[PDB]
Each structure stands twice: as C-alpha cells, then as structure tokens.
C-alpha cells in the first residue's frame, strides 16, 4: 500500500509582520515512512530544518512535523516542497496567512 | 487517559541494519525516543516529567529497546520469507501497543496490533488472550505466538506494568497532563466575490487534541459545505483547528460556530 | 516504560 | 520438575566438567547458578534460543550451551578448588516470569587437589542402653558415621526393610574430625527413638544405611587402600531382651 | 537489591515474621519469596506487587511505599526449618534474571512438655571397643557447646519426632577415642 501525503503550511502563532514565529510544514498520512521534506523562503531551502520524532497515525499511516524559527515580512514568500515515492514531481506548498 | 508506544522497523537491503525507531505517548503528550541509526542509540527523554527519572530507568529502557531492535530484523526477515517478497525491496514493520485507564476500576482497555508495509497483520484480541490474524501468512505468526503462550507475555505487561507506569506518569506531571488547555478562538472574514465571503472559525493552543468545530446557519447544523482540515500541532504541545464556510454577502451574522472541546466549562457558540 | 520483547513474527 | 545431571560429583584441581540440565515441561529459557556453601545463588548466564542472552560475573571458562529441545550444558574446565559448590539449574517461559522461576534439586560439584583426599565412611550402630529403657520407657539407636570425604553422603533409617522417618533424627551438617584443615574429614551422627517395646522384640530388624557418593568407574586408583568407590555402608542391629 | 536479617528464630505453632528491605525498587519490579530445604533447591513460596497476598503456605505484607515487604508464616512447624529468600524480580520480559542475597536462616524449636535430661552410654553392637554418649530429653534452650578437646567429637542439637506416641525430643551426641574420657564429664 502507498498513501499520499497530506502537506499543511501554516504558523505556530498569527502572523505578525516583524516578530519572531514559527514556521510548520505538517506531512500527514503518507506511507512508507521515507520521505524528504524542505521549507523554501522565497525559492530558496532554508537551513537548519528541525522535525518530531516519526510517528504514525491508527490507520497505519505516518505523520511528520517541520518546523524554523523565522520573522515573517509583507513581502517574503514562504512555501514548503515535499517529495515522497507516490509523487510524481516534488509538491510545492505555498504559506497562506489563512489557507 | 491512555499510553502509547509506536514502533516503526523499516529494512533496507545492502544498506546495513533495518532501522527501528520507537516512540511513547501519554494522551497527546511525547516523552520518549528511540533512533537506532543514532550514533548514541539510547532512550532519549521528550517530556520534563521524565527526565527526572533516574539512570536506572533509561538503562532499562535503552537496553529494551535495543533487543526489541534485534528481534524486529528476524521478524521482517521471517515476513519476507512468508509473503515470497524480494531480498531487494524495503518493508515496514509497525507496532502500536497501550493501555487506557478509567477513573476508576484500573485499565479500560489494552491492545498490541502489527502491520506489515502499511496494512493489518496480527492484532491482539480485547480479551488479551487470542490473536486475530489478516490473512494466511500471519497464521503462521498466530501459531507460532500460540505456542510460545505470546499472549499472556503481553498481557502480563498491559493488564499490570503499563497501568502502573502510566498512573505514575500522571502523578509526576499532573500540572502538565491531567489539566486542560481551553482553546482560544475568533472569526476571520475573507470576500471571495461581489456577493460571497468565507467566514473561518479558529482555534489555537489546546490540549487534548481533540475538538469539534463546526458551523450552523439558523441555528441548524451546515456540514455539506464547511471544509475542515485535520488538526494540526502548534509545534510547543498545543494543537490548531479551522473550519471555513462560504456565504452569500449580508447574510454572514446569521451563521454562528459551535467549538466543543474538554477545557471548556460549556460549548462556546460565537459569531462574526 | 516500554513494554519487553517477545517471541519473533 | 527440573533435571540435573549428575546428583554428585567428584574432579581435580585443573580438570574439567561438563553439567546437564533439562528444563520443565513447558518452559524453554535456562538459568545457571553457584551456590557456594554458606552463601546464596550467583547467578551464571540465562540462554534462550540457543543464545547466551545474559551473563554474570564468571569467566569466560565458565561456558555454555543450549539444544533444540531447551535442553542445556554448563561446561566449566581448569576447575579450581573454589569452584566446589552446587551448581543450581532454574527453568522459565520465554525470559520471563509469568510461568515462574523453576529450580532443580542441584548439581554438588567438589573438586579437590588430589583423588587420595577422597576416604569412605564407616558406618558404626550404638545400641539403646538399659537405662534409658528403664528410665524413658523408650530405645534410643545412635548411628555414626566416621571419616569420609568429601561431603557427599545421605544417611537412612531402615527398619524390617522399610525406610522411617518418624523418631528419626539427623544432624544438619556434619562435623570435621580435624578443623582448620582444608582436606578434613567428617563425621556425621543419627538417632531413631521406638518404643522399649518394639527394641525389646528380636523380630525387628534395625539398620543404618549410609550412602556415599565417590569415584566412578572411569578413575586412576594407585592406593593400596580401597578405591572409595560409590558405595553404600550400612551396619545392622537386633531386638534385645 | 535487598537485605534481610541473617536469622530468625522462632518456636513450634507460632507466627512468624520475615521482613525484607528494598528501598530503590521501581515500578516494573516485582516481590518474590523463595525456600529452600537443606540438599534441596529453592522453591516458590508467594509473590507480589502492591497489595496483600495470601495462598494455601504463607502471607505477604507490601506497604504503599513498596520499599519493604513482609514474609507471614501463620503456624510454623519443625518442617519449616529452611533458608527463606526474599528478590525483587525485573518484571519485564527478557530483563534481567533473578538474582538472589544471602537469605534469611530459619530455626524452629519444640517447647517440650516435661523434659527429663539426662546423658546415657550406648555401647557398639559388633563390638566392645566403641561406645558413644548420648545426652537426651532437655530443654529446647539447652546450649550444647562444642568441646575443645583434640579428639573428643560433640554434635549439634537435633529434635526428633514419634508422631505414634506425640512425643518430641531433643539430643546431642558425644563421643572419643582417648579411653580415658568419661561419660559424666561429657556435656558440662
């Protein structure tokens, strides 16, 4: 079996232009636990990507967290590029304020 | 309240030993780690209500763990023996077992269920004492754990050492574990049209997990058209859940969200 | 605490 | 319950030894232990599937193994004259404890430096003396057992050709007819009280049978003196008057 | 780990208390208790977590704390006399084996009902050369000391049991080879 992943960008807090926050990219319900997940800020990889511990959900499936400290802007872009075997191509995942 | 263990043992031919990763959960709350890949494989800590333990406790744990890593690789090495499967493709091997415990009356509930590359394998019987097998080749896993009495191993464990480990854990983090985080809620207004908006229901920072939002027009539930997404950690202990709903202009303080979670004295009924 | 190990699959 | 092989035994200092042990019906994990006398058990490995899962404090001469059938073997060679102690043989289910530690009646190993140091006992029956029987009303036999080595030895009462145990007494451990030795010999000493009624009857027949655990068929012997063989030295008594 | 007392004594039919001290133990331990008979090997006696067990032998006391545990023989009898273990056991599977401490040597006497003490000679029924002397019938505190001499041989106390007449008896043995080695002067 191979379950495609759930991808959701989003903000530990609400976006306030100019302090300090969190960014999360949280992968869901995707199987075989391999998987390689990146945070982009305006089209570039972001270094030093931290993760939770894998775990996985009741119907089997597995669930990950990535998550950077970062200061948002009006201006910067942020997305989250996801690449799994049941993906074709690398997902992108753009950073709505409220998806 | 409930503790979970989920193990995940996943191979990987020419590469070297299959890693096994191991973690535990109290509710929604992570306090302990396993990575056998790490060039320190011990059992790290993930809660402040475990690393006041000892090092006789985490001796124990790491040395389990470690043997539980050795007895996976046979198993995924008799799984791919069963099903005929390739020496050159990867596999899974999953574990999820716990123990639920009542207010009252010691455990509720108790369960030790497997899954080979993401379905049902053999799963352990409410009753603690028989198996349940998938298909043919975890017959062959139930005969063998039928005679080997597996079962009353097992039972051993989640009727009297996990009630016991969890009824502690509980006492030794009760300002952080037994209370409950109210989520913190609002309305958000979006136009997406001449005449349509979507108004989004909100909430942030609450323990446990699990919550109910949903929105009503007229007082009368709307669930056909409210898109909900999955509940998300907040990334420091807390989780974040929205629903959205679309709506003709003018009509929007008509239609009211209904938040029910274990923080809060009553369902909270808020409209934008 | 974490369950002990068993009988192999 | 649990099976171990052999019951008693006798080796020299630098030989080696093989022990067997065969588990509970049931069970299939195996447990070793050295039990040095006045002391507990010191655990020695636990094997399981045909693995040494778990070890103690002892060298790597104290080695192992474990068959198919949970069946185990406790190889120790360059015996030391420390090493004499009995060696103890508990049986479980799956390196756990649902189905209970299960030990077996023991192995007593004694190893000494030289075969001479091995001596039979001589078994000697006292009778009752007539003023006891006039006094008590009651036949006091006194069976003695003098100068064997090493402690290997198991003493029975056997009356009319049927082993008692009611008015029987024995010694809990024997004495050393020379302390401060460390190849001393014993010395151990019994006592059946019967009615003066039952002594006073020449039908009865009373005997004192002393069993030793010695050398074995398979033993260089270059004394003059009797080879101590295992053997069974008993002395015999009548009613009287 | 644990530590108990060295020894317990006690007298026929009464109650009799063992206590053990664990201090570090945890939560995945449990309590044992094991005896073992001279010659023999060690047999189960009872087990235990937290709360009070009772079987058909013997009786376990664990107080909240779990840091100490209570061994209770209702009625001891003279077949009581063995070496009593108490372990604290690793309660998860492939953990480690039970390992043991030095134990508890329990000693049972008989209060004897109209002792007569008194020191017989018994001489060798095949032959004239050997004769032994036998002190018998005294009180279970009587304390047989060993005698220094270089060959004169002194047992131990020993308790013997006619069940026919329910008669129970104390007796020590003493003999030598010196020919000059009276009887009286034997046991004083």
């Avoid at chain 1, 969190?22 to 995707?30: I, K, M, P, Q, T």
């Avoid at chain 1, 990950?64 to 872009?77: C, M, Q, R």
């Avoid at chain 2, 590469?15 to 306090?31: C, K, L, M, N, S």
């Amino acid at each position: 079996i191979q379950r495609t992943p759930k991808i959701q960008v989003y903000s530990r807090h609400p976006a306030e232009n100019g302090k300090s926050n969190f960014l999360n990219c949280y992968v869901s319900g995707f199987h075989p636990s391999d998987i390689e997940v990146d945070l982009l800020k305006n089209g570039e990889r972001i270094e030093k990507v931290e993760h939770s511990d894998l775990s996985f959900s009741k119907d089997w499936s597995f669930y990950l967290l990535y998550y950077t400290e970062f200061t948002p802007t009006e201006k910067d872009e942020y997305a989250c590029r996801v690449n799994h075997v049941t993906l074709s191509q690398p997902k992108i995942v753009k950073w709505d304020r409220d998806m | 309240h409930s503790m979970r263990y989920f193990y995940t043992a996943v191979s990987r031919p020419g590469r070297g030993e299959p890693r096994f990763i191991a973690v535990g959960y109290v509710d929604d709350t992570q306090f302990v780690q396993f990575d056998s890949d790490a060039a320190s494989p011990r059992g790290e800590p993930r809660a402040p209500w475990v690393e006041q333990e000892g090092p006789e406790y985490w001796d124990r744990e790491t040395q389990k763990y470690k043997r539980q890593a050795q007895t996976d690789r046979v198993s995924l090495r008799n799984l791919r023996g069963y099903y005929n499967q390739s020496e050159a493709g990867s596999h899974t091997l999953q574990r999820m077992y716990g123990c639920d415990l009542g207010p009252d009356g010691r455990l509720l509930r108790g369960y030790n269920q497997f899954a080979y590359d993401g379905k049902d394998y053999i799963a352990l019987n409410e009753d603690l004492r028989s198996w349940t097998a998938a298909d043919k080749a975890a017959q062959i896993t139930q005969r063998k754990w039928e005679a080997a009495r597996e079962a009353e191993q097992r039972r051993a464990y989640l009727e009297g050492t996990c009630v016991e480990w969890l009824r502690r854990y509980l006492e030794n983090g009760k300002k952080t574990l037994q209370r409950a985080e109210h989520p913190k809620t609002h309305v958000t207004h979006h136009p997406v049209s001449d005449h349509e908006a979507t108004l989004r229901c909100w909430a942030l920072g609450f323990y446990p997990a699990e919550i109910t939002l949903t929105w009503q027009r007229d007082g009368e539930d709307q669930t056909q058209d409210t898109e909900l997404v999955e509940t998300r950690p907040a990334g420091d202990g807390t989780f974040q859940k929205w629903a959205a709903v679309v709506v003709p202009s003018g009509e929007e303080q008509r239609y009211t969200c209904h938040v029910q979670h274990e923080g809060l004295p009553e369902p909270l009924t808020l409209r934008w | 605490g974490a369950d002990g190990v068993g009988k192999s699959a | 319950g649990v099976t171990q092989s052999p019951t008693h035994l006798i080796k020299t200092r630098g030989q080696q030894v093989t022990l067997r042990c065969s588990p509970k019906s049931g069970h299939d994990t195996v447990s070793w232990y050295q039990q040095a006398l006045g002391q507990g058990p010191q655990f020695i490995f636990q094997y399981y599937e045909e693995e040494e899962r778990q070890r103690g404090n002892f060298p790597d001469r104290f080695s192992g193994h474990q068959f198919p059938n949970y069946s185990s073997e406790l190889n120790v060679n360059a015996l030391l004259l420390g090493d004499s102690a009995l060696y103890l043989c508990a049986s479980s289910l799956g390196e756990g404890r649902v189905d209970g530690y299960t030990f077996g009646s023991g192995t007593r190993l004694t190893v000494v430096e030289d075969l001479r140091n091995v001596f039979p006992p001589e078994v000697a029956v006292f009778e009752p003396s007539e003023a006891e029987i006039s006094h008590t009303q009651k036949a006091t036999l006194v069976c003695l057992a003098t100068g064997f080595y090493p402690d290997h030895v198991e003493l029975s009462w056997w009356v009319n050709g049927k082993e008692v145990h009611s008015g029987v007494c024995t010694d809990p451990q024997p004495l050393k007819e020379q302390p401060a030795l460390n190849d001393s010999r014993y010395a151990l000493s019994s006592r059946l009280r019967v009615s003066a009624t039952f002594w006073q009857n020449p039908r009865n027949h009373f005997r004192c049978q002393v069993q030793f655990y010695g050398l074995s068929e398979n033993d260089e012997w270059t004394q003059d003196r009797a080879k101590p063989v295992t053997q069974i030295v008993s002395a015999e008594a009548w009613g009287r008057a | 780990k644990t530590t108990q007392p060295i020894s317990v004594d006690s007298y026929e039919g009464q109650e009799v208390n063992i206590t053990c001290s664990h201090n570090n133990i945890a939560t995945n331990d449990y309590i044992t208790w094991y005896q073992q008979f001279p010659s023999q090997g060690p047999r189960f006696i009872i087990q235990g977590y937290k709360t009070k067990v009772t079987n058909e032998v013997a009786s376990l006391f664990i107080p909240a704390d779990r840091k100490s545990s209570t061994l209770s023989l209702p009625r001891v009898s003279l077949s009581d006399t063995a070496v009593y273990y108490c372990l604290v056991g690793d309660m998860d599977q492939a953990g480690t084996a039970l390992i043991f401490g030095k134990g508890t040597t329990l000693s049972v006497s008989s209060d004897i009902q109209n002792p007569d003490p008194a020191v017989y000679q018994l001489r060798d029924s095949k032959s004239s050369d050997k004769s032994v002397c036998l002190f018998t019938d005294f009180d279970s505190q009587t304390n047989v000391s060993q005698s220094k001499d270089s060959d004169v041989y002194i047992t131990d106390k020993c308790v013997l049991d006619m069940r026919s007449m329910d008669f129970k008896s104390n007796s020590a043995v003493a003999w030598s080879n010196k020919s000059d080695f009276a009887c009286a002067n034997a046991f004083n």
